[PDB]
Amino acid sequence: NDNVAWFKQAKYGMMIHWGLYSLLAGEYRGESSSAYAEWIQSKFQIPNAEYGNLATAFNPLYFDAKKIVALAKQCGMQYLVVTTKHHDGFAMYHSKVDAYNVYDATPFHRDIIGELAEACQKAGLKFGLYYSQDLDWHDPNGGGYKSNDVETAGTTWDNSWDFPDEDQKNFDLCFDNKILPQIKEIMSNYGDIATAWFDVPMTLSEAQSQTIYDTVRELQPNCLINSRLGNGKYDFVSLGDNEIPKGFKPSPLGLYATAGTINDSWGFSYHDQNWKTPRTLYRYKQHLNDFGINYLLNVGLDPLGRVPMMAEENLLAAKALEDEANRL
Amino acid sequence: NDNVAWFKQAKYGMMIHWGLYSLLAGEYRGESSSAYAEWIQSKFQIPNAEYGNLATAFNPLYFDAKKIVALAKQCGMQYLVVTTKHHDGFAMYHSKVDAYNVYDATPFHRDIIGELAEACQKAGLKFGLYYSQDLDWHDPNGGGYKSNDVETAGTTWDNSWDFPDEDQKNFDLCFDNKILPQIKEIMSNYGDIATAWFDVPMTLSEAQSQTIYDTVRELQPNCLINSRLGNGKYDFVSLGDNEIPPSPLGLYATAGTINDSWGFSYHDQNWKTPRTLYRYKQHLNDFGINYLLNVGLDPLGRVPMMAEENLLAAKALEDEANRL
Amino acid sequence: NDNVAWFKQAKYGMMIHWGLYSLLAGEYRGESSSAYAEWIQSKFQIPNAEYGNLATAFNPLYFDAKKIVALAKQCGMQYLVVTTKHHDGFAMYHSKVDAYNVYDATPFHRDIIGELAEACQKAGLKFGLYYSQDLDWHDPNGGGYKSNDVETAGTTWDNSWDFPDEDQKNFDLCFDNKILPQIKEIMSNYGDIATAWFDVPMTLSEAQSQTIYDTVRELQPNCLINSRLGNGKYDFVSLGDNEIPPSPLGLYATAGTINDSWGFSYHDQNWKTPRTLYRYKQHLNDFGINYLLNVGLDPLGRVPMMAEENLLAAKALEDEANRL
Amino acid sequence: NDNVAWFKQAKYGMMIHWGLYSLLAGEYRGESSSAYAEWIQSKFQIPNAEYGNLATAFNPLYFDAKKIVALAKQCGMQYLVVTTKHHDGFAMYHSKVDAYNVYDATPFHRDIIGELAEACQKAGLKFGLYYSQDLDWHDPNGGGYKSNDVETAGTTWDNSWDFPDEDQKNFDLCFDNKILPQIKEIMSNYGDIATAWFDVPMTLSEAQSQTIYDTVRELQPNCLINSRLGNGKYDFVSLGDNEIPKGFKPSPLGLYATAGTINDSWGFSYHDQNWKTPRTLYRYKQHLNDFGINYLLNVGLDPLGRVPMMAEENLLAAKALEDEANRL
């Protein structure tokens, strides 16, 4: 595994947040989403009935994996991570296990994870995946229902509106039927997976944590796994903003990575125009790389599946400043 | 016609700019539209082939004429004007003459002009219409091709990219086949039409100007017609920002937007403050001018959050001031 | 003390953040301050030599206590709290103990705390005070030097740049010579003090905490004291955003800003909408919590245009809702 | 005069808008200025009594000609133009003719035009000047009083509030006593003047127009004069946005220049955060230079005499993109 050595020198990567939440764009019935526009279903407790129907409008005419990767490559990013399934429970790939997915449920009728995976392979970029293994608002036994004693970017961590029976909920049902199967699907198809990013488990047993680890190992041996998953079930540690240099779970390979956004939201949002300046993006990348931390910078694709104009402008301007500085 | 008397005391009205241009939202291939996001097809000379295909994505799940009118009524607006067909040539009604329309060409498969017309009738608001009688970028013989000696919010006034033959163009073909017929359609259906707003003709004969006037008169007698159409072919005059302080009825109206674009746009967040909207309305009404304030509906057919907030805040300030 | 009963029904109050930090306006040598523009001295570790010199530029021509209070009263705010001295150590009153103050050190040469105190009295508003009893970046033995094991809105909690000798620092020197004396000054002059807001002590002994409590009690008996000061040394509790849905009187209050900064800042245009301000006030008042909404005065001592607009628009919506 | 040849290859220049209007910052008594924050005195018809008093607050601690020029030079700008006196009538130099100036009337007590002129000389940049030869709101017989039949960025073109006697006004009084003398002062001192930018005359006789031309010629022979001044009294033509390629006064030397701002205001303004993107600044410069037009890009200094943070960021980012493009 010299995939470890490559990750040491990778430095820069593109993250993609895309789903049904992108269509609403941080706006619901004349009122604003939280800082996080992807959390909008939980924020307004939108019935799966209504939220799911967004799938019927999902027809991103200007989606183009080739261009998205081409941009990423031109900004010097060596890998591309993408959301296979967020908390909303909607898969952005052709899931055999659940028909609540982009291919089956939308007019678009195309596997986005597939196109990106291929585009990356052809452009010579590594391909990473992200999957919400705990939270699933579409699933009756969705995770988080025994972990609401803290506030969120929405309301509850689980779907407490469609399924108001915390006392008679059992995540084991959700894990065996959707989670473990869907993780197999994405790790089986879409060629070589170089990175796998998971959420901090809240309603997940140690068995279920170890299960996923083994599942990824058996299917994608060379795949580097994120620390969020389990304390003895990772390769590289994900540092979360407040864990950045001027408790700490040991990194035995000495691999570190920090996910960040260009504006204040991961999912796309009309009202969020607070785009980090070219200078800020370059300077933060510089700081993280100097402390041996990979910078995973997120683009939130819009309803037509385009990179927001200002997101592109600033990504390219940040590259220019970096290049100009490396000659000076 | 006491429709004249009502227009004198109308004061406030809602304008709706909605079409395929709303889906792009002032953004095309990583580059920004002009101040006017509705002019985006001309701005980037987008082939009718590509631009038209936007119709396939047009599925506004959260469109609701009832609510849009309810908002308008709550802000004190007495009439609602809507775009039947803009310069893009795409009809937002069920046009028998052209299949390039919301009902036939989109998954949505619904007559928006119809729903709004009905919603207005039931809510007790008058219903106005707007139609681009000159410019049509979808039509081979689209107007503006003999009037490019001045700059626009796009490139050329006409579709000079799909149809680059200015020398062998003839608008008479476009007028007889699409324009006059489509004006009949909207003025025939959708109940009583109280106002009709037209563009300044550039490539339109006096005959064609008088034709439309007579067509509207014959179909909608009570309908008040905008001055833009023709010098002896109107009831009320439209003042254009720089004309703010002959109308034989003594009727005047000024169209304005909440931000800087008529059509919806992501990057345009320059929403006029509640205070500005109220103060401008106050000024225009005090000089006997009707304020037609435009909402540019987004891809899901929603009133932009900040557009709603400011419209309602502007009403509050007006109400608070009328008690004080 | 029916000052307790009044605080129960007070509901709305104005907060004022003003000092030398207001002149820089979240900007230093081509680079941005934190979310908190008042913390700018710590953020860039600006020498007291340089930062203090800002006093020479402090000449706010358009400062007017009368108008500031008049605005507050028109928005329905029943009391006005003001910064006597922030972490920067610069007093905004005529301090006999330290010449590092607005009256002595500036061309302005006027006691701002005085004018506001008077303006409030004449307008029929209660007058509150805020004093940084722990942190003082101007003082050699400024507090926070044994509490840097956590991150701030600047760099260190103390002035670690002018005075880099944490090992040979002693806060007792600072407390006896500046803090206790200056607290006496503000609580002695400027008429009746109805509220007193203090910071969470980090480098303050229980003795020093009790000292301040007794000092305020002896000088301003009717004055309600904030919970931040000491666990058995308050009347009302200050809830800090994340504490929103023991107080023996059953009194609670939450401080908030209109944008994301307390001190004024050019680049911070993220003004909470009229709707947001009203709705948050409504929520807090419904849960028996007083809303203390902060205005950060600009270099000329003006209420920022958008701060005023939104405060008045928020009042309008509240009034409109109380009739509806 | 090979000053003509240098102007042909100059391409990029910095403009400085600074005065009493900068202290108000597009804000007066809770209400906003026009697009133009420098026009604020006319906008709210602020008495000379009140407006003039701003001089007492003018103490820009962080003003530094060296740094301003250093920035300009680093962005590749070959000359720096500055406002000696705008419409407000307030001179930013040590005027012997009028005590309504930065040196005499302010705590600052320093000649800004001087420091910049020197800073430019030492850094190896040419030095240009701008003077409002027609409009003067401080002068009783200020110009514009017979030209109010059109709307402005304020109210009237002249000071119609302090001096409401259009019928008994005579500009000849203003020209002989302030204008011609003050133009001599700035063209006599502050070393070599390479460029001189004037306003379109509205209330100025042909004699008075020719007078200024001759005055500049006699004092600064090598100085290139702007077309705005007079039809037979210039070297290079100033194109005003709507005169840019995809009536036209002939340019005999073939010299063209276009003034533009980074945001929508010339003078500094708090509420105007509409900063043209790095991409826009570079692309516009590219377009103008390709059509043989010099790009004069304006910085509006703030109350402390600093280049606004975002103005600097975008100027430097625009340089980076230009440099990156000239290697690619």
Numbering used by the authors:
A (entry chain A), D (entry chain A): 2 to 247, 264 to 345
B (entry chain C), C (entry chain C): 2 to 246, 267 to 345
Please share text taken word for word from the publication where this structure appeared.
Lactobacillus casei produces a GH29A α-fucosidase, AlfC, that is ~104-fold more active on α(1-6)-fucosyl linkages compared to other linkages. This enzyme is particularly relevant because α(1-6) linkages form the basis of human core fucosylation, which significantly impacts the function of glycoproteins such as antibodies. AlfC is a single-domain enzyme that adopts a (β/α)8 fold typical of GH29 enzymes, with an active site at the center of the barrel. Our results suggest that AlfC employs a conserved hydrolytic mechanism with a specific subsite that accommodates GlcNAc in α(1,6)-linkages, while AlfC tranfucosidase mutants work by shifting equilibrium between open and closed conformations of an active-site loop.
The mutation of a glutamic acid residue at position 274 to alanine (AlfCE274A) has been shown to convert AlfC from a hydrolase into an efficient transfucosidase that can transfer a fucose moiety to an acceptor (e.g., N-acetylglucosamine [GlcNAc]) from a simple fucosyl donor (e.g., α-fucosyl fluoride) with nearly quantitative yields. We solved the X-ray crystal structures of both of these enzymes. They exhibited no major conformational changes compared to AlfCWT, with CαRMSD < 0.25 Å for each of the enzymes. Only AlfCE274A showed a subtle change near the site of mutation, with a displacement of the W198 side chain ~4 Å due to an alternate rotamer conformation in order to occupy the cavity left by E274A. The point mutant AlfCE274A is markedly more dynamic and solvent accessible, particularly in the regions surrounding R229 and D242. These residues interact to mediate open and closed conformations in MD simulations, with these results consistent with AlfCE274A sampling more open conformations. The marked perturbation in R229 provides a potential rationale for the azide rescue seen with AlfCE274A, if azide ions occupy the E274A cavity to stabilize R229 and promote closed conformations. The reaction, monitored by 19F NMR, revealed that only E274A could be rescued by the addition of azide, reaching a reaction speed of about one-third of the wild-type speed. The HDX-MS analysis suggests that AlfCE274A and AlfCN243A are transfucosidase mutants that work by shifting the dynamic equilibrium of AlfC toward a more open conformation.
